[PDB]
Structures are given as C-alpha cells and as structure tokens.
Amino acid sequence: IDPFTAKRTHRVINHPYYFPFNGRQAEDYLRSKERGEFVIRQSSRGDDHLVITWKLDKDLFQHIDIQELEKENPLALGKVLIVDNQKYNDLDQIIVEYLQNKVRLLNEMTSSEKFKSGTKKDVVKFIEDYSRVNPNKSVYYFSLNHDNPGWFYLMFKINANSKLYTWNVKLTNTGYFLVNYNYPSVIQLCNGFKTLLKS
C-alpha cells in the first residue's frame, strides 16, 4: 500500500481546473453545480494517478481514474494519460473527447422519451402500473442507477403478467454498453434491445 497520498504528499497540477480537493470535498463542491461540471484532483494514493470528479445528477457523481505514464519525475504530469484503457495526450483531450462525450450521451438518454426519472423503486412501481394500462403490450424504460454511478437500469415487461426484468447499461464515452456491444446512440440502443429479445 502506497504512502504517497493526497494528504501526505500533495501535488499541484498546472491546470485551471485542478483543485486541492479530495473525493468527498470534490463531491460537496459539485453539489451546488450543474451536470457536467467537474474538478481535476489528485488521487487518494499514488504519484501516478489523477481523478476527474464530475456531476451526473443530483447527488450522483463519478470519479474518473486517470493513469499517468511517461512522467519526468514523481511530481510532473505524465506525458501520456490512460482513461478507461484509452490513450490521451493531455488533460484537455480527456475533458473534450472523454468527459464531454459522456455528458453528451448522458443528456441524450435523460432527454429521451424512454427515460424515466426517479429511484429504482419508484421506477419499478411506475412500470408495473404502466404495463397494466395496455396489458397485452410490452413496455421498457431506462433509469439512472444511483448505486453505481455511470450505469442505467433497463427495465422491461413482455406484458402485464410477465416478470419484470432488469438489465444493466453502462455509459461510456463512445456509447451505451449493453451485454456485449457498445451502441453509439439511444435509437440504436433501443433497436439492439429489441433484437436481443428475438434470439
């Protein structure tokens, strides 16, 4: 276990969005901010890790791990940065190509007619009540997974008397990962899902 920590050995990163916050302090700061707003900060441990903490929704934040490679020395920002096993050349590239694309896809989903706001329980009750309006027709909705920031639930009933099933969709910077495929848009994600039901 690494004694190089944000508390004992603080690094300063030369970027206008770098803050001296830890994870909790970053979340608290972002509580009064809007979706997509973020801070770059040191990781709790390691001289070669940074984090971008960003806000998805009310009380919902994600901490993006950044691995630094090709560091000149323990303090220098790595000349290569890995996020989600993808290479980036600098922090701005991560912010634009990774973060902002994730935000774009988040917005796309929560603005879709197929998305339902609320907790998992409240959404379950809604789908159940909703499927009984037209008992013979299948229903499905996406919702936010608050336990695991960055994931959506995909809940669906074949009909009113069928079991309510729940699948997991992961938000990525290039689309929505369901099962074993990354769908570039919500439209294509919905088409994929309907194809899965027919296998």
From Swiss-Prot:
Present with 8890 molecules/cell in log phase SD medium. It comes from Saccharomyces cerevisiae (strain ATCC 204508 / S288c). Residues 16-113 form the SH2 domain. This is Transcription elongation factor SPT6. Transmembrane segments: none annotated. Histone H3-H4 chaperone that plays a role in maintenance of chromatin structure during RNA polymerase II transcription elongation thereby repressing transcription initiation from cryptic promoters. Mediates the reassembly of nucleosomes onto the promoters of at least a selected set of genes during repression; the nucleosome reassembly is essential for transcriptional repression. Essential for viability. The chain holds residues 1247 to 1440 of 1451 of the full protein. It is found in: Nucleus; Chromosome. Interacts with CTR9. Belongs to the SPT6 family. The gene is SPT6.
